[PDB]
From Swiss-Prot:
Protein keywords: Antibiotic resistance, Hydrolase, Plasmid, Signal
Binding site for substrate: K207, T208, G209
Native species: Escherichia coli
Family that this chain belongs to: Belongs to the class-A beta-lactamase family.
Active-site residues from the entry: S43 (acyl-ester intermediate)
InterPro entries xrefs: Beta-lactam/transpept-like, Beta-lactam_cat, Beta-lactam_class-A, Beta-lactam_class-A_AS
Catalytic activity reported: a beta-lactam + H2O = a substituted beta-amino acid
Protein name (record): Beta-lactamase Toho-1
Pfam family, one: Beta-lactamase2
EC number(s) per entry: 3.5.2.6
Gene Ontology biological process terms from the UniProt entry: beta-lactam antibiotic catabolic process; response to antibiotic
Superkingdom in the source lineage: Bacteria
Summary of subunit composition and partner proteins: Monomer.
Length: 261
């Protein structure tokens, strides 16, 4: 069976809806499955918020070290880093690191607030040529992931294209690109997702996300040992609100599409 047939069969077994976009940077070839359909991003949107702050830092050499006060009232759900810093400060760089490497929701909200609200994250995506991404809400409500709701969604292809531009391409100046890559490579939350479907020694940078409707996502840049990088988005969502998340599906999809590479 072809790769496409393999993805169809994976989706058929899944009890939900699978979205995959792989870009092989050797030749700009793509493996696309529901790649123009919308999925709730959940925490994968944290990449765009962090990158928007990195863009600002290009023109403000003091920005990344700017102090941000962390107050008890800022805490939401899932803030393993920010809760350590209540009554103190974190820098914008530290908030980027926490948002990306630990998926800290308070850190995400501080980035969004710094930028001036969700719509400013959308504007940043648009400035990179991404016509699809939209951020509408803050944490935690951006994870409701209701089927057919356009809020806080993108498509697998749009996200793969933008992730490529951010990490390997033209979106950010070099120091900021390098910082984003360093952050993604140091992610702690993605062991069981795309990474689990790849050779153990491949270098990977990724950002996971999950939400209601069993929405289970991962976006990654992958550096094989003897090949050009791959950019891979795997999004998955289910019909029932309290469905379990399914990172195993993402690992399985990653294994299918990276075969041979």
């Amino acid at each position: 069976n072809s790769v496409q047939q393999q993805l169809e069969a994976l989706e058929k077994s899944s009890g939900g809806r699978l979205g995959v976009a792989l870009i092989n940077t050797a030749d700009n070839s793509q493996i696309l499955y529901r790649a123009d359909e919308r999925f709730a991003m959940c925490s994968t949107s944290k990449v765009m918020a962090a990158a928007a702050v990195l863009k600002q830092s290009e023109s403000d050499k003091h920005l990344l070290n700017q102090r941000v006060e962390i107050k008890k009232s800022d805490l939401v759900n899932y803030n393993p880093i920010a809760e350590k810093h209540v009554n103190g400060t974190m820098t914008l760089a530290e908030l980027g690191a926490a948002a990306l490497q630990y998926s800290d929701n308070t850190a995400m909200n501080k980035l969004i607030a710094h930028l001036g609200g969700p719509d400013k994250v959308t504007a940043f995506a648009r400035s990179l040529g991404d016509e699809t991404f939209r951020l509408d809400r803050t944490e935690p409500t951006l994870n409701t992931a209701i089927p057919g709701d356009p809020r806080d969604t993108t498509t697998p292809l749009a996200m793969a294209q933008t992730l490529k531009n951010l990490t390997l391409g033209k979106a950010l100046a070099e120091t900021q690109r390098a910082q984003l890559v360093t952050w993604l490579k140091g992610n702690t939350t993605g062991s069981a997702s795309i990474r689990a479907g790849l050779p153990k020694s491949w270098v990977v940078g990724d950002k996971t996300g999950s939400g209601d409707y069993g929405t289970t996502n991962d976006i990654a840049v992958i550096w094989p040992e003897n090949h050009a990088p791959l950019v891979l988005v795997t999004y998955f969502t289910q019909p029932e609100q309290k469905a379990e998340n399914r990172n195993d599906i993402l690992a399985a999809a990653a294994k299918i599409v990276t075969h041979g590479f």
